[PDB]
Design a protein around this ligand. Structure first.
Ligand code: 23X
Lengths: 99, 99
């Protein structure tokens, strides 16, 4: 699809057996999901945003389908106000910026 | 151009006659640049994301050339981690997300 940027580029994603709305975010190196109780091992991480840093749980090799396109990779989970699909997954679904 | 996402989508901008490197950030509502001088009146504003809010200076109707494309719009200036081109200007330059 083509997504214009008049509004937030929110799309439906499928992860760990939930459908979620998530921002396709070219400014995000990593994918950051709102708090959710994913199974499996994780590693602690701190990521820096506009207001400072938050602590997140890093889960590896998590399947995520982004409206139709399958990806698998690292997902960070923590107290973000929005689900963020970052470049690690955007590259996998062949997402580009175009102008 | 078409810009892939295996690297940060950093582009050269020209603003107030100065060249800077800024991140094309579809997850950002607004454009916020690191502390710098810009001509004209500004008003205090606060903007937020992960880690909470920061105080910025809002400059309206500021010309910025982004990767050779002209925009004129709101530029926020403050303690952002990186120079960010947000949707307010990405829309002006005709930027879309495609996959
Ligand atoms: C490169 C620095 C950048 C800040 C990283 N983040 C991604 C960014 O697009 C966020 C997304 C966002 C939107 C709304 C609420 C909260 C966040 N936008 C924002 O924080 C913007 N907020 C809004 C409301 O658009 C602000 C810029 C104000 C306009 S980020 O979200 O802080 C982020 C994401 C992934 C990641 N991986 C490693 S460090 C890292 C940091």
């Amino acid at each position: 699809p083509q997504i214009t940027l008049w509004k937030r580029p929110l799309v439906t994603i499928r992860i760990g057996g939930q459908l979620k709305e998530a921002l396709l975010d070219t400014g995000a190196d990593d994918t950051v999901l709102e708090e959710m109780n994913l199974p499996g091992k994780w590693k602690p991480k701190m990521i820096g945003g506009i207001g400072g840093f938050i602590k997140v749980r890093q889960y590896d090799q998590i399947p995520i389908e982004i409206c139709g396109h399958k990806a698998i990779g690292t997902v960070l989970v923590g107290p973000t106000p929005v689900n963020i699909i970052g470049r690690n997954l955007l590259t996998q679904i062949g997402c580009t910026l175009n102008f």
